[PDB]
Structure formats: structure tokens, C-alpha cells
Amino acid sequence: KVFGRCELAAAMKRHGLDNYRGYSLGNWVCAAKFESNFNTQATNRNTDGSTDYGILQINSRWWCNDGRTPGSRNLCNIPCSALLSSDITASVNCAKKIVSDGNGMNAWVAWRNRCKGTDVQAWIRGCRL
């Protein structure tokens, strides 16, 4: 499912991401835009053999199991395929664990390079929240 900007903001807000760990809603929507272009079915394989899944491109090396990333962890306790669902619940719950890990949202390099320090509030402007 390809989400609309405001449609995703509302879905994330409903799942408790607004201000989660001090990160305003604009930050999460911006991260999703550049990580997957709002597409829940997005996947990208990395040089180390791991693969990123879903709207927030969560990595298989540590957070989910895809059965093909040798010596990987499954800290979110979910099959990676569950992160490609049109229902973002699984992605959201796992993202909350990731952002609490220690480096905050810096864990997402697209956020660090394209959202961090910018006017992220622009990502939710015009939305009925």
C-alpha cells in the first residue's frame, strides 16, 4: 500500500508515534517518505546480505527474521514479511523499539541525511490531525 502524506501522518499519530521519545510526527513522516516513498512493500538488499523492509526500511540483521540473514537477530520477534503489510502496526511497534535503542532516529540514515535539522513540521502541514 502506498500511503498519502496526511493519511500516513494520521495512522502514525493513532499508533502513538507523535512525540515518541521526543520525536515529533513530522520526523516520522519525513523518514518514511525518503526511506520507502510511503510504500509498505518496499525492500532493499544491502551489501552485507541483510535486507531492509517496509515503510521504515527495518533491517533483517537485527530486527526481523527473513530466513536468509545468517547470524542475525530478531529483536522485534517478527517475520520481516510482516513489515510489508498495509497495516503499519508491526512496523510501528518495531520502530519504537529501534528508536529507544540508543542512537534515536539516527538509526535511519535517510532521516539523518534528509530530515534531521530540517523543518520537518512541513510534512504534516495542511493535514487534519
Curated annotation (Swiss-Prot):
Function: Lysozymes have primarily a bacteriolytic function; those in tissues and body fluids are associated with the monocyte-macrophage system and enhance the activity of immunoagents. Has bacteriolytic activity against M.luteus.
Pfam family, one: Lys
Family, as annotated: Belongs to the glycosyl hydrolase 22 family.
Disulfide bonds: C6-C127, C30-C115, C64-C80, C76-C94
Compartment list: Secreted
A GO-annotated cellular component: cytoplasm
Catalytically driven reaction(s): Hydrolysis of (1->4)-beta-linkages between N-acetylmuramic acid and N-acetyl-D-glucosamine residues in a peptidoglycan and between N-acetyl-D-glucosamine residues in chitodextrins
Tissues in which the protein is found: In the egg white and polymorphonuclear leukocytes.
Molecular function GO labels: beta-N-acetylglucosaminidase activity; identical protein binding; lysozyme activity
Gene3D superfamilies registered for this protein in UniProt: 1.10.530.10
Documented EC number(s): 3.2.1.17
CDD domains on file: LYZ_C
Comment field (misc): Lysozyme C is capable of both hydrolysis and transglycosylation; it also shows a slight esterase activity. It acts rapidly on both peptide-substituted and unsubstituted peptidoglycan, and slowly on chitin oligosaccharides.
Binding, substrate: D101
Keywords, sorted A to Z: Allergen, Antimicrobial, Bacteriolytic enzyme, Disulfide bond, Glycosidase, Hydrolase, Secreted, Signal
Domain C-type lysozyme: 1-129
Subunit structure comment from the entry: Monomer.
Name the record gives this protein: Lysozyme C
GO terms for biological process, alphabetical: cell wall macromolecule catabolic process; defense response to bacterium; defense response to Gram-negative bacterium; defense response to Gram-positive bacterium; killing of cells of another organism
UniProt xrefs under PROSITE patterns: GLYCOSYL_HYDROL_F22_1, GLYCOSYL_HYDROL_F22_2
Active site: E35, D52
